[PDB]
Amino acid sequence: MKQEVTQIPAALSVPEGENLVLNCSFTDSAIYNLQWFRQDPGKGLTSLLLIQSSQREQTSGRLNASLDKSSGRSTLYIAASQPGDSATYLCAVTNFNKFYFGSGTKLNVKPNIQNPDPAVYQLRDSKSSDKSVCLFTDFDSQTNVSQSKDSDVYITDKCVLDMRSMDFKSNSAVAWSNKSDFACANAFNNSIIPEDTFFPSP
Amino acid sequence: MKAGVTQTPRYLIKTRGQQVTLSCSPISGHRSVSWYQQTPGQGLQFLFEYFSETQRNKGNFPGRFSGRQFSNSRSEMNVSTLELGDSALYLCASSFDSGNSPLHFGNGTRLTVTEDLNKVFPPEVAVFEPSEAEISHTQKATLVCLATGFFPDHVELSWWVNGKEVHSGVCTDPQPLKEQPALNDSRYSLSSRLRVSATFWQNPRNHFRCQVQFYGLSENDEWTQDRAKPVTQIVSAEAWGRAD
């Protein structure tokens, strides 16, 4: 028979501190081992757990995975999630003479922003660039950043930085363009942003 | 201190029809070496496993994908008659015994297959200094670095403050944005942020550098365009702190 490995959800966004559940199913129960991995962007895979076909579970740290071989299922439980858990999580099984990987769960664990202070700032032009650059920053993690209506305005998704020695984390998104009918006042107009967002006078 | 799984080369750009050979050295004491192709469109797919110099298991790839293993457990794979869809991260994994011991992965060889080397461009890199309003409102100062117009997506962006690589206060986008999302060999853009205290930014002795390593053409690639040959290179931009 043909092995098929299915993982759900495809993507999971959750607030830090919450427990998480990652599901893996396989249609051919004749496996030797099941393994869970994480993968960060720009990197290879890191083995988290290997469950032998004769075992029902394995634990390391905050991770616990069950295996129900006859049912064709494994569940990875991640307790008390942390931002450093953000990664793609892959389920694989080892069959008699083949190896098969699921398509993954992309996990994003969002920081709790203690004191949101949403604002859109204009960065200084560079003497060596022709772009105008705007920064939407310090919004809480429930805010969604959309793409522009304009194909020549570029907007990134929210990225979390951690100023470690200040115990401070913040979200931001960057917008830029080299078109002339473009201003920071209007850059994020296609996003639902906080009504109290600070727009400094240019 | 102990070496992990190593892979060489890191990055390759080839035209259609060419061939490549990739190498992997397992962790010392591992004897099972496995290769996998990871693409956005098909995910991670098994190529083949070697142990004690012979192929033990194999996937479903056509014969133009081949492998081998030497007596010291190093392994090579080869791909002949390269096609666009062979663009992928080629990952190798070592294990003491793949049947009951964990797989340990390398970081991969990133291969991009393109129709034409004239599609290859290094990044332009710029730094944008912080907003006055940010500094007055928050007592913090965000620098932005933009890397734009590059192809393929073979870049590494890093920040350096007074000559020391920093990760605190940094966030780099996980993936680049396609500058023309509908074209297959569109150029890419990437953004990154470095946030520091206002006090730190206000010291003119502090020096900030955004570094982008771009991995491009070989010295053995022919180049007949007027513009500069897009070889492997570093493109950088910098700033100094500024008082009031």
Residues A92 and A1 in one domain: yes
Are residues B44 and A90, on separate chains, in Cβ contact within 8 Å?
yes
Compute the distance between CA of residue B134 and CA of residue A165 in angstroms, rounded to an integer. 19
Number of Cβ within 10 Å of residue A183's Cβ equals 12
Report how many domains make up chain A.
2
Which of B106, B67, B75, B68 is CA-nearest to residue B90? B106
Is the preceding peptide bond at B176 cis, omega within 30 degrees of 0? no
CB B194 within 8 A of CB B200: no
- Give B145's strand partners: B127, B192
Q: Which residues pair with B164 in a beta bridge?
A: B161
Using the Cβ of B98 and the Cβ atoms of chain A, whether some distance falls under 8 Å is answered with yes
Strand bridging mode A63-68 / A11-15: unpaired
Nearest chain A residue to B171 by CA distance is A161
Structure token pair of residue B158? 């890093």
Does a cis peptide bond (omega within 30 degrees of 0) precede residue A9? yes
User: Can you tell me the distance from the alpha carbon of A175 to that of A177, in angstroms, rounded to the nearest whole number?
Assistant: 7
- Inter-residue contact A27 to A4 (CB < 8 Å): yes
By CA distance, what is B168's nearest residue in A?
A163
Of B14, B47, B213, residue with least CA distance to B119: B14
Phi, psi of B27 (to 5 degrees): -55, 140
Integer angstrom CA distances of residue B228 from B119, B121, B151: 13, 9, 14
Q: Rounded to whole angstroms, how far apart are CA atoms A119 and B112? A: 39
Of A121, A157, A176, the CB nearest to B131: A121
User: Locate tokens 């020549």: which residue?
Assistant: A152
**End position of a domain, from candidates A60, A76, A111:** A111
Identify whether residues A71 and A146 lie together within a single domain.
Answer: no
Residue B221 CB-half CA count within 13 A: 18
Residue type at B98? S
Contact between A33 and B140 using a beta-carbon 8 Å cutoff: no
Residue with tokens 């133009």: B64
Cβ contact (<8 Å) for B106 and A44? yes
If asked whether residues A5 and A86 sit together in one domain, one would say: yes
**For residue B152, cis peptide bond before it (omega within 30 degrees of 0):** yes
What's the CA gap between B120 and B82, in Å, rounded? 17
Domain ranges, residue A197: 112-202
Query: Which domains are delineated in chain B?
Result: 1-115 (2.60.40.10), 116-244 (2.60.40.10)
Among A111, A127, A157, give the residue marking a domain's end.
Answer: A111
Regarding whether A119 and A26 lie in a shared domain, the answer is no
**Element of type H or E holding A42:** none
B137 and A166: CB-CB below 8 Å? no
d(CA B95, CA A97): 16
Residues A105 and A120 grouped into a single domain: no
Q: At what resolution in Å was this solved?
A: 1.4
Yes or no, beta carbons of A32 and B100 under 8 Å apart: yes
Say if residue A62 is in the same domain as residue A143: no
Q: With contact defined as beta carbons under 8 Å apart, do B234 and B156 qualify?
A: no
Experimental method used, please?
A: X-ray
Tell me: do A119 and A107 sit in the same domain: no
Residues 6-25 of B with CB under 8 A from A: none
Do both A103 and A124 map to the same domain? no
Q: N- to C-terminal Cα distance for chain A?
A: 66
| Pairwise CA distance, residues A73 & B182, whole Å | 38
Could you give the CA distance from residue B243 to residue B203 in angstroms, rounded to a whole number? 6
- Tell me: do A86 and A76 sit in the same domain: yes
Whether A59 has its CB under 8 Å from any CB of chain B: the answer is: no
For residue A118, list chain B residues with Cβ-Cβ distance below 8 A. none
**C-alpha distances out from residue A4 to A7, A98, A101, A175, B178, Å:** 10, 12, 9, 41, 32
What CATH code is carried by the domain that includes residue A65? Answer: 2.60.40.10
Q: Please tell me the distance from the alpha carbon of residue B216 to that of residue B6, in angstroms, as a whole number.
A: 21
CA-to-CA dists, residue B132 to A192, A202, B140, B195, angstroms: 25, 10, 10, 14
CB pairs < 8 Å spanning A and B: 150
A105 shares a domain with A117? no
Q: Are strands B11-15 and B109-114 parallel, antiparallel or unpaired?
A: parallel
Q: Clarify whether residues A83 and A170 are in a common domain.
A: no
Which of A90, A111, A132 is a domain's end point? A111
Residues 110-139 of A with CB under 8 A from B: 117, 119, 121-126, 128-129, 131, 133, 135, 137-138
> What gap in Å lies between CA A197 and CA A40, rounded to an integer?
32
> In the structure encoding, which two tokens stand for residue A39, read together?
């993968």
B198 with B135: CB under 8 angstroms? yes
B203, B196 contact by CB (below 8 A): no
* Residue A128 sits in the same domain as residue A196: yes
- Picking from A142, A183, A143, A138, the residue whose alpha carbon sits closest to that of residue B140 is A138
Q: Are B125 and B139 in contact (CB under 8 A)?
A: no
> Looking at CA atoms only, how far is residue A178 from chain B in angstroms?
12
Three-class SS of residue A98?
A: coil
| Cα-to-chain-centroid distance, residue B173 | 13
